[PDB]
């Protein structure tokens, strides 16, 4: 069951690396909203969720060509491991 | 400081013999005491010259000279129990030199060993050398196969032997090589995988017939 | 001279090579086309080689 234990670690290692990039870009600019306003505060709580959504779909527009091919390769690899 | 004081406290395992070519021969008895006495002369705590001799290494030394100056000679072993008068076990039924040629051979062997005084040449028999190997190989109850041919015999022991017949064949062979040497009779202990220990029969129309000894063995389904 | 070198043939492609030295065409059945043969063969007496090979292989023939 080497291919079974390899496809399970590859599936969870690809979950950690695909869901970690827009999560860190969702909190780099989330920290650059709160740390920037230490002078001339004017703080409102619901304000950074719009910029965080624009920052998420911005980096998804960059990594859309890479997120597809890292799933296209693992998808073609996991069926070839099953059939042949 | 003399040489017999520079060795160990037990002054009974080494025997110092004065040579004839102005040297001094230390006579050990095995390979551990040979390196014990060679380390003394190697580090150099002795001002004269000294050599260490043996019974094996002084028996492969004067056989190299002998298959150049006296080829086609039949002999067994040189015994060094008394190191000042060695015994040369010569074969009887395979040589043709007379009494005058044996004095020349006993003088040219005396000149090779300067620590000796006179080499004694005794003509041992040739059928008791194989009789003492077969009666001793039959006493331990080992499955053997004798192969007589011209100028030497050969005993072969094959099969899937157990640990008792391996320890007994090693114990007898090493006690026979020390007396006669491997010049006439040779032993052939080899381990294959067949429950028949060497022998092989073929079955047809009357019973079994004993086959001749060949190279191929039939593997055992068992 | 002549001869056939079979390397894992199938007793139909082997016996058709002997169909020139034997001056008749050979017809091999279906169950006798499952056994195989290999080795260098030489054809200088094919009537005695067919009678000896049909007994070492186990075969019957009829002309």
């Amino acid at each position: 069951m080497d291919d079974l234990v390899f496809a399970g670690n590859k599936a969870l290692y690809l979950v950690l690396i695909l869901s970690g990039w827009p999560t860190i870009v969702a909190t780099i600019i989330g920290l650059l909203v709160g740390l920037f306003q230490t002078v001339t505060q004017l703080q409102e709580q619901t304000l950074p969720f719009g910029i965080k959504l624009l920052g998420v779909c911005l980096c998804l527009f960059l990594l859309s060509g890479w997120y597809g091919e890292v799933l296209l390769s693992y998808g073609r690899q996991v069926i070839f491991l099953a059939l042949a | 400081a003399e040489l017999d004081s520079l060795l160990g406290q037990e002054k009974e395992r080494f025997q110092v013999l004065p040579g004839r070519d102005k040297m001094l021969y230390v006579a050990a008895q095995n390979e551990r005491d040979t390196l014990w006495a060679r380390q003394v002369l190697a580090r150099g705590d002795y001002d004269k010259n000294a050599r260490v001799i043996n019974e094996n290494e002084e028996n492969k030394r004067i056989s190299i000279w002998l298959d150049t100056y006296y080829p086609q000679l039949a002999y067994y072993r040189i015994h060094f129990d008394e190191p000042r008068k060695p015994v040369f076990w010569l074969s009887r039924q395979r040589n043709t030199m007379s009494k005058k040629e044996l004095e020349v051979l006993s003088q040219k062997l005396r000149a090779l060993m300067p620590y000796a005084d006179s080499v004694n040449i005794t003509l041992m028999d040739d059928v008791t050398a194989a009789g003492q190997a077969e009666a001793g190989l039959k006493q331990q109850a080992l499955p053997y196969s004798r192969r007589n041919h011209k100028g030497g015999v050969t005993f072969v022991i094959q099969g899937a032997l157990d640990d008792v017949e391996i320890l007994r064949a090693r114990q007898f062979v090493d006690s026979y090589y020390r007396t006669w040497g491997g010049r006439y009779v040779q032993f052939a202990i080899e381990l294959k995988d067949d429950w028949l220990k060497g022998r092989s029969f073929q079955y047809g129309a009357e019973g079994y017939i004993k086959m001749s000894p060949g190279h191929w063995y039939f593997p055992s389904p068992l | 001279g002549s001869g056939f070198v079979a390397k894992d043939d199938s007793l139909r492609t082997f016996f058709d090579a002997m169909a020139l030295q034997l001056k008749e065409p050979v017809i091999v059945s279906k169950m006798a086309a499952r056994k195989k043969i290999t080795g260098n063969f030489e054809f200088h007496d094919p009537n005695a080689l067919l009678e000896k090979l049909s007994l070492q292989l186990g075969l019957i023939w009829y002309f």
Binding site: - | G8, W36, Q39, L167, R168 | -
Partner: protein
């Protein structure tokens, strides 16, 4: 005194010293405290001492057991790493029971490890054993080969007498006298 080994421990230094004293050279053990032991020989005995260090592969490596590759304080414990840890303590316990016979100085036992015999549908194979021993001299060592084969036979599930191999041997000659200081 020319040093040749340093930073050893207690069990390694007593083997390098015991090897060199058999070949007529004397060594000196020096405790450097926290760093470890050390061994020094003389200068005429230095060229000969490096030759026996190279020959006997000294200092000795620690003896490896199969239960070290699968430690007990790991996270995962597979069934292969559980039967490989059980069979290693069995051959470590049978050796200590072999040293308690009458006239045995050392022994080593090897059990046939089976790995994929359990996870397939096939039943596991029989068990094969092997043992070495070093006896005290003066004993008729051909006859004590049928007591190790009797003690090892029904200590397992099912073995035959053709599947146990005992290879034993008498010990070497005793070394009791001093090497001797190199005079010049």
């Amino acid at each position: 005194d020319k040093d040749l080994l340093k930073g050893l421990d207690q069990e390694q230094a007593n083997e390098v010293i015991a090897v060199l004293q058999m070949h007529n050279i004397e060594a000196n053990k020096i405790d450097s405290g926290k760093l470890g032991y050390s061994i020094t020989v003389a200068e005429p005995d230095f060229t000969a001492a490096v030759y026996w260090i190279k020959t006997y592969q000294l200092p000795p490596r620690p003896r490896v057991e199969i239960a070290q590759m699968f430690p007990a304080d790991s996270l995962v414990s597979s069934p292969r790493a559980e039967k490989a840890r059980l069979y290693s303590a069995i051959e470590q316990r049978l050796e200590q029971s072999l040293q308690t016979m009458e006239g045995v100085l050392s022994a080593r036992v090897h059990i046939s490890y089976d790995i994929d015999a359990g996870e397939n549908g096939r039943p596991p194979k029989p068990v094969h054993l092997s043992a070495l021993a070093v006896y005290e001299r003066g004993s008729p060592l051909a006859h004590q080969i049928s007591d190790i084969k009797r003690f090892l036979k029904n200590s397992f599930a099912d073995v035959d007498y053709d599947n146990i191999s005992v290879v034993l041997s008498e010990r070497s000659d005793a070394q009791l006298q001093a090497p001797g200081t190199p005079v010049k």
